Amino acid sequence: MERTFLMIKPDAVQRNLIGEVISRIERKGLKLVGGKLMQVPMELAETHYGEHQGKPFYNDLISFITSAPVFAMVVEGEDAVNVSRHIIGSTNPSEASPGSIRGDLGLTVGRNIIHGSDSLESAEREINLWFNENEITSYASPRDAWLYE
């Protein structure tokens, strides 16, 4: 079943919104399958974000993501990548639909609560970069037969 990588960013951690953000992911029907609070080492940050190395904001993005712990997640469900992006909302919290994590909780592009993989391909990369096979569990849940048919 499809998986994506989500990460609760240091702004959410420092605003004490960890539980609230998990709750929104959970209630949507997505299954938390891996999860760890962690300080992000500099090279993880640079390899996770290098698409952006050239850009002006780059050195701010790296400083921010390493400034306090993040909550790294692997999340499972039918169409999980797009589902996550859907409930997370647009990159810019002022464009993100009310009701979405970024729409309800964030102000600025740079401080936008959470990260989600933008595609199937980057999901498998991101999951691989952040987690080892043995940190990601597999389990049936009571609601599974009620989420899907």
| Token pair for 138 | 């597999």
Contact map string, positions 71 to 90, toward a copy of itself, x by CB under 8 A:
------xxx--xx--xx-x-
Question: Taking the alpha carbons of 115, 121, 127, 128 in that order, is the dihedral positive or negative?
Answer: negative
Pick from 111, 122, 124, 136 the residue near a copy of itself by CB under 8 A.
111
Which listed residue (4, 7, 10, 76) binds a copy of itself by CB under 8 A? 10
Provide CB contacts within 8 A for 82, sequence distance 6+.
none
Q: Which of 48, 52, 86, 115 is catalytic?
A: 115
Per CB under 8 A, the list member of 40, 103, 126, 130 interacting with a copy of itself is: 103
36 is in an annotated binding site: no
Active site residue 48: no
Asked if residue 2 binds a copy of itself (CB under 8 A), the reply is: no
**In this chain, which of 41, 99, 121, 135 binds a copy of itself, going by CB under 8 A?**
99
Number of residues that bind a copy of itself (CB under 8 A): 37
Question: Is 16 within any annotated ligand binding site?
Answer: no
Spatial separation of the C-alpha atoms in residues 3 and 74, rounded to whole Å: 7
Which residues are marked as active site? 115
**Binding residues for a copy of itself (CB under 8 A):** 10-11, 14-15, 24, 27-30, 60, 64, 77-79, 82-83, 86-87, 89, 94, 97-100, 103-108, 110-111, 143, 146-149
Residue ranges at the known binding site:
9, 57, 85, 91, 102, 112
